[PDB]
Design a protein around this ligand. Structure first.
Ligand code: GTP
Ligand code: GDP
Ligand code: GDP
Ligand code: GDP
Ligand code: MG
Lengths: 439, 430, 49, 108, 430, 430
């Protein structure tokens, strides 16, 4: 009865969508072609997969998602790969010319002929769903079409639907290791776009996941596939409570109700535990206390940030496997006893605990070891202002000498847009500073 | 014949009521299919208190099942003894409460209370002579707290003279599972004192404490905690369903436990309790049952009763026994602990005997006590509430459904006045 | 300081008034009992039309 | 407080050494009966645990499985009687008949 | 009816208590499962002195076991007759004492003593008519000598009038198992004189010496000494449990044995002890029993009785005999050893008779004596203490846990005064 | 009537005086602006013992604050409860003493003592009948000890009959603040032994011990230490202001405690003192109140009372208690611990009872005992001083200011004479 819609825009969004959707198909037992092969499947009320998939009227199941990109290479690769028969042919919208790392092109010039088709397809997906919980958005901030279409689509959906929840798993540039050169510009512009039009935003920096893979999985040369698999595991852990039985279950309206104190502040970072390979999986007890202790270490954050420099405001924790409430309560007691992690004064209790019975699933050919316990973290903390400060420092260096701005101004964008974006980002930074002070 | 209907809401309310009907069915010898398979005729004489009658000789409880999401009632229908529940009694919404007091009390609670109240009215009027209502819900949740207290307000308006019982579960700071619990806890407590005749506080911190210490079982589960609560629930109304040396109904206990109408918060406990490896070494006698009854660690509440003075107390006994020891044991405990009983109410203890013990036992005791040490629960809850409220944290959720800060402000004053009233009567001498 | 004396003395001179009369659910039940006990006579002495 | 050793040599047979008592001590015969009973109990189940002493610790306890009417009959715990497979899709929801509505009534 | 409770601490105390409870169960015909399997009705008339009753008719000893390390209680639970003890009476820590008096009396003893004190209080209030306490512990150990004496002080403060006994295993130089024995031994000796009403002093050296002469067994073991001490302990309280011609309870011993308040250190003995070879070649008569009783090598202390004079003595006969013969033998021995008894008190020997001999024996005698020869046992302990304390050896372990050397200085002084005031009567004449 | 005036000297004195006047004002109910806020009539019966009537009904203390630096007055005046003091009583120098006893006694004191004597004479003649003077200072500093001892020296010859008491914070070597502590301390004692009628020694080392052990608070501050001294300081004159069974003013204690004129140094202690997390249980009765009184740890001096013999003792009880149990407990402690009491004063303990307990407490007691244990503190200071006098270092600044080595030699000899004549009574026998 309950459904969610996943939106994937940009090359990073599509390459994360591939991993999360293969994980979902393997979780629900759907073969790559699209049909359940068990042949023992029955009717009645066994429709636990309706959250993600949907009956096709004859045989297969069609996922509730759309793919957007103005560059046809990745979408054609999807249409050529082994998952060719799964996705609906029409719900993979592709363009002709790339945005070429330009925010203006993907927001003012060539996104207007794709946004209409995207809204049409989203409506055709939404009328099918009867208990639509909300939307999930995946995009790379540091990319032209990514940021531009994400901005335009979020603005359009904010007025088209309104009160539906919107969650964004976006990818900001890393503080020092990055691919593009002009990513601060479209980064800050998309920051403005998503500041006042999303409900929950999650930080997904890259070198943090690189370090996590190198330290824990003992992989000396990770690639994007490992990062996508880890992000898929995070998404599955977050969404598991909707479709599996558990002692303490949560919903989309459960998360944001207990996790954001004020409408302006909704930026937060995630963590996962345990991350372990097959060789080390033998010689560890993997107790609930141990995994929860490892979940709060600064090196396990999915964003390159150090929470030791700031205060917390909330913590939403999801368990899956065979954990017990008394053990998790003892673990929270120990965490509260610890002095290195400190909270804000006006939040005496700050833990929301969800428990799910389904143990995590493993993808053959993957890296994570097969385990019976796992915990996911969604923490909102004041220390997130560092990532915004570093992006602001980079932006000023180039904007002082007005580098690359002729391209941004030749596509119709006025010069004052940069000044407005800087003013609003500075205003956001101040708010995070005044929240963490004492009464 | 002075029957009582059952009402339960929320996830916590549903699970407690899911096991309470399991214990009662075993007590009266009703199989999960609904057929009587007892041994004695006393099990069947007063069956109308809980069970109605249907064709084929099967008995159906008069329980009403409410929640704002369909997830919970799927579980209660699939569990054991789940075929004993009326499909028409289930009333559910498709949105949920979202741990928000405002959402479950103003927007969805208002638009759904019409359907459930019609079930309550039809259930209540069908009986020949009603006796009262009992409600099981949680004060830390969204739909249990919000729409649950909305029904209490409506029921009290249409049925004034009846008895309203509430087995309430308030959250404790130690075992906390929600960041926004202080808001929807304080708002409900303000509403609870408005209408409820009797309130019986329950804490998961206390229920866990019993399992680790007394029953010595290593891995407690919510099913184990529900059993202790369900055992006490059947105890308080034991003699209403069976004969006894002395009779006592719900109204009688309210008379002997409420010195003032605003002081209607009780703390309950059950005896005996012994670990599996220590059952053979204990002798069950009236002295042993009463020794365990007044123990501080035996309460189902986090408050320590030796930090205050008892105002009134009651003790219900199960099984055959001598009235001489029962009378004198209550006399001895009052004489030895005169410092823990306030001095302006002599003979502040009540005795009651029912001759039918719980299934599988020989002697059982249910304790209900009115104490001034309960106020430290509201003190610590209001301690957390004012810390959050001074910064107006999480307030945009509550304001989004028309509720203004005045309701928050008046909830503080009314809660403080109730706390101030308990302290004043403990600080009173003749 | 002398007006402080006067103000404080007169405000202190008022303390012992308790009169416990909390009545929200009890009063609602009370007014129902009085109504049914008294309005039966008014019902039974009504003049037919 | 002593190592129970029994052998043919009398200086280390305990029973031969502790026969100075005015009576027959009720520790040696009890120990021998316990050893024989534990051997028989192991034969009934089948353990052959490389020595008789491994299973002797928990074959002597008198703890009954069930309760004896001095506490609530809650059993040893819900977690004790639980089995766990780990196939994917094992704990999916069932959506019983009470909440499975189809036709969405239109009037009120 | 004038029943006693048992408290045991430390490894030595636990071993003595286990063996003693084995002996008592044998005497009363109680199987390891707690079911009565006696043959005579006399075995049940006074079972309540040492045993309680529970569901199913099984009898549970009212014994309390305490220690700081779970090593020994896990062994006694797994040993034979280990199921008699109630599992709730096992109270233990996790750190141990490490042969340090401070660790068992100031920090770790104090934090844990609350639970054992609560258990003792519950057991003492449960029984109808308390008569006294008996303690088994070791003075040379860490947890025993410290925690046991702290509990001694607490229980003596709480119950002022009830009689009290101790069976202390004080270390002796000939058989040494620790280098820090003098310190805590002197401290506990200081702490015992103001609280313990009766002390039964015991050495391991004397028991080995007895085993090697009288018993003539090649390879004794700790079990033999344990069982000898257990036999003496059981023989102490024969008349309070069984019928007789001259019933004498524990208070009757104190009145006949304590002339002055600070003179309460006794030495005990048992008879008859026969070698394995000469079991059937020896006749059992009163003269033989008293001759072996007053033989100096039959005592359980290293002190030689012939180096001093007896103040008072008491003999507790068991079995069927003639009163005239016993009294005649006591008079004859007191007249023939006139130089060994202090002159200013006439007829300083008491005799009591019980009608039940031990299991499998015709007659048995337990002898308790108060003699000035105890001066030597304390003298040799203090001799080591000063020669070790002058160099302040091993003293930083004690002073590193809040204790000052002023305590050592005061404890040494009190022992010397006790010895002097105890030996002044060896020289004083009327 | 029988009024006493307060004068405090040095930085230590002002800090002690600041808390003391806050403590007394709370007891007698005086607000920061000097207006009465008590509830009973007895709060004004003897308010004149420490206060003067001012126009408008305000009360002001009789405190004269003196120093050599204004950094203390401008800090104590700006603090809370600093408005009570009259500015005319603020006297201070402009240069400072620099921890130089000679500077505070010879060169800078001589010109400033004209001012303090004028104001102190005005206050002394203002009262109807003077009772005595009380002074707070420390012997480790220069200004506090220097002009201090000079101040008592001259005011004594104007008032040779009125009693003079002083509270002395003697420094300790384990926790030392000034390198020249032995010098100015030895000189101060010489000028203080022959002038002050009563002197009380206070060790800052013991204050840390009490806070760490009994109070069990992690971080103490100088404010908490000042609170400990003031509580004991206030209780000495408790019966001087409130009625009691046996009221005992300062002169009564002076006569009964000092057997000889040259032995007037006292140690003090307070009881009860509980931890911060004190559970609500029982009440502080006399047997436990007197047990904590005589505990060597509870003493606020580094001199261990068990190292010597008590010359005499005095207790100041607060609360409504029976006189019989108070009297017999003192006989009990005397008999039990007769080794610590000199035998040539039979019944060497004095008791007093006051009906008004301290605010918020049921029963309290204050101990003032004169024991031969204080010779250790004199002996240890003399050893440091003679080590620091042979070196002839830090002397030329003392010497280069009007005096020479003759005063130091006579001071050391007199202090040595005091110790010798103080030990003779310890070893004296009757
Ligand atoms: N974590 C992660 N990031 C990716 C992945 N693929 C692309 N990115 C991010 O995308 C950024 C570059 O933008 P692209 O995704 O290549 O292209 P775009 O965002 O669609 O914008 P255009 O270049 O105009 O097409 C890089 O800095 C990466 O951080 C991926 O598979 N995993
Ligand atoms: N004692 C007890 N407490 C429960 C049970 N189920 C849930 N809870 C408590 O209820 C709280 C959550 O309440 P919730 O389900 O949100 O209430 P609702 O939103 O009104 O349905 C948790 O903190 C649990 O501790 C139960 O079966 N027994
Ligand atoms: N008779 C007897 N003595 C024992 C036994 N076990 C230990 N001891 C004595 O106890 C002494 C050691 O005391 P210990 O048990 O370490 O004291 P604790 O540490 O306080 O428990 C040794 O000198 C032994 O002689 C026993 O089973 N029987
Ligand atoms: N109890 C207490 N002792 C203090 C305080 N201030 C200083 N002292 C002690 O006094 C000694 C130094 O005295 P000092 O300040 O030089 O006295 P002054 O010369 O009169 O100012 C140090 O050893 C401190 O321990 C205080 O506020 N309370
Ligand atoms: Mg692209």
């Amino acid at each position: 009865m309950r459904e969610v819609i996943s939106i994937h825009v940009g090359q990073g969004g599509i390459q994360v969508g591939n991993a999360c959707w293969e994980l979902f198909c393997l979780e629900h037992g759907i073969q790559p072609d699209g049909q359940m092969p068990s042949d023992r499947t029955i009717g009645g009320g066994d429709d636990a997969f309706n959250t993600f998939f949907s009956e096709t009227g004859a045989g297969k199941h069609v996922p509730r998602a759309v793919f957007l990109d103005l560059e046809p290479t990745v979408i054609d690769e999807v249409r050529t790969g082994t998952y060719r028969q799964l996705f609906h042919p029409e719900q993979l919208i592709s363009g002709k010319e790339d945005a070429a790392n330009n925010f203006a092109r993907g927001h003012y010039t060539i996104g207007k002929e794709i946004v209409d088709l995207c809204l049409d397809r989203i409506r055709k997906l939404a009328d099918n769903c009867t208990g639509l919980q909300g939307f999930l958005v995946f995009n790379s901030v540091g990319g032209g079409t990514g940021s531009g279409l994400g901005s335009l689509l979020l603005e359009r959906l904010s007025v088209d639907y309104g009160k539906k929840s919107k969650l964004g798993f976006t990818i900001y540039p890393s503080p020092q290791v990055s691919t593009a050169v002009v990513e601060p510009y479209n980064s800050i512009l998309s920051t403005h776009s998503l500041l006042e039009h999303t409900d929950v935003a999650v930080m997904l920096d890259n070198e943090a996941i690189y370090d996590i893979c190198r330290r824990n999985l003992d992989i000396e040369r990770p690639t994007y596939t490992n990062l996508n698999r880890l992000i898929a595991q995070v998404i599955s852990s977050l969404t598991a409570s909707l479709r599996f039985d558990g002692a303490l279950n949560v919903d989309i309206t459960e998360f944001q109700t207990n996790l954001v104190p004020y409408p302006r502040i909704h930026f937060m970072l995630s963590s996962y535990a345990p991350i372990i390979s097959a060789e080390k999986a033998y010689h560890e007890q993997l107790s609930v206390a141990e995994i929860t202790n490892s979940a709060f270490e600064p090196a396990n954050m999915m964003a390159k940030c150090d929470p030791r420099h700031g205060k917390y405001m909330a913590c939403s924790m999801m368990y899956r496997g065979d954990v017990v409430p008394k053990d998790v309560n003892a673990s929270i007691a120990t965490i509260k006893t610890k002095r290195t992690i400190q909270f804000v004064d006006w939040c005496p209790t700050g833990f929301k605990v969800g428990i799910n019975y389904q143990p995590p699933t493993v993808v053959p050919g993957g890296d994570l070891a097969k385990v019976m316990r796992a915990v996911c973290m969604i923490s909102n903390s004041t220390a997130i202002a560092e990532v915004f400060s570093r992006l602001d420092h980079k932006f000023d260096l180039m904007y002082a000498k007005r580098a690359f701005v002729h391209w941004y101004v030749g596509e119709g964008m006025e010069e004052g847009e940069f000044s407005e974006a800087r003013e609003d980002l500075a205003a956001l930074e101040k708010d995070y500073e005044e929240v963490g002070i004492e009464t | 014949m002075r029957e009582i209907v059952h009402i339960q809401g929320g996830q916590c309310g549903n699970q407690i009521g899911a096991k309470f009907w399991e214990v009662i069915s075993d007590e009266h010898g009703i199989d999960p299919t609904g057929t009587y398979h007892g041994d004695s005729d006393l099990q069947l004489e007063r069956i109308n208190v809980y069970y109605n009658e249907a064709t084929g000789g099967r008995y159906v409880p008069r329980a009403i099942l409410m929640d704002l999401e369909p997830g919970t009632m799927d579980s209660v229908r699939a569990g054991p003894f789940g075929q004993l529940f009326r499909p028409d009694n289930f009333v559910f919404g498709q949105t949920g409460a979202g741990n928000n007091w405002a959402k479950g009390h103003y927007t969805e609670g208002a638009e759904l209370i019409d359907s459930v109240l019609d079930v309550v009215r039809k259930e209540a009027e069908g009986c020949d002579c009603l006796q009262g209502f009992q409600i099981t819900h949680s004060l830390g949740g969204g739909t249990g707290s919000g729409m649950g207290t909305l029904l209490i307000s409506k029921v009290r308006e249409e049925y004034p003279d009846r008895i309203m019982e509430t087995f309430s579960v308030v959250p404790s700071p130690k075992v906390s599972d929600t960041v926004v619990e202080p808001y929807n806890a304080t708002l409900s407590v303000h509403q609870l004192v408005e209408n409820a005749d009797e309130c019986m506080v329950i804490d998961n911190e206390a229920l866990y404490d019993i399992c680790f210490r007394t029953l010595k079982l290593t891995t407690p589960t919510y099913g184990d905690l529900n059993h202790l609560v369900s055992a006490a629930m059947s105890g308080v109304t034991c003699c209403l369903r069976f004969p006894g040396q002395l009779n006592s109904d719900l109204r009688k206990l309210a008379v002997n436990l409420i010195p003032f109408p605003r002081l209607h918060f009780f703390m309950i406990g059950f005896a005996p309790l012994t670990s599996r490896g220590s059952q053979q070494y204990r002798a069950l006698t009236v002295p042993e049952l009463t020794q365990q009854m007044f123990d501080a660690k035996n309460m189902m509440c986090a408050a320590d009763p030796r930090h205050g003075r008892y105002l009134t107390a009651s003790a219900l006994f199960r099984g055959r026994m001598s009235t001489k020891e029962v009378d004198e044991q209550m006399l001895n405990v009052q004489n030895k602990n005169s410092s823990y009983f306030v001095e302006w109410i002599p003979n502040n203890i009540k005795s009651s005997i029912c001759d039918i013990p719980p299934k599988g036992l020989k002697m059982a005791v249910t304790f209900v006590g009115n104490s001034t040490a309960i106020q430290e629960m509201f003190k610590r809850v209001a301690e957390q509430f004012t810390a959050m409220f001074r910064r107006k944290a999480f307030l945009h959720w509550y304001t989004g459904e028309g509720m203004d800060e005045m309701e928050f402000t008046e909830a503080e004053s009314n809660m403080n006045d109730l706390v101030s009233e308990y302290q004043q009567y403990q600080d009173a001498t003749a | 300081i002398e007006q402080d004396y006067m103000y404080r003395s007169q405000q202190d001179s008022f303390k012992p008034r308790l009169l416990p009369k909390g009545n929200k659910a009890s009063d609602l039940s009370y007014t129902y009992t009085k109504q049914k006990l008294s309005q039966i006579q008014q019902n039974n002495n009504k003049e037919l039309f | 407080a002593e190592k129970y050793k029994n052998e043919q040599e009398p200086k280390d047979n305990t029973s031969i050494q502790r026969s100075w008592l005015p009576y027959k001590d009720k520790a040696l015969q009890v120990a021998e009966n316990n050893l024989i009973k534990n051997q028989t109990l192991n034969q009934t189940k089948g353990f052959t645990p490389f020595n008789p002493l491994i299973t002797y610790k928990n074959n002597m306890s008198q703890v009954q499985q069930h309760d004896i009417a001095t506490s609530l009959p809650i059993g040893s715990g819900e977690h004790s009687d639980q089995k766990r497979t780990n196939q994917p899709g094992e704990f999916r929801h069932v959506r019983t008949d009470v909440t499975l509505i189809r036709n969405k009534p239109v009037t009120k």
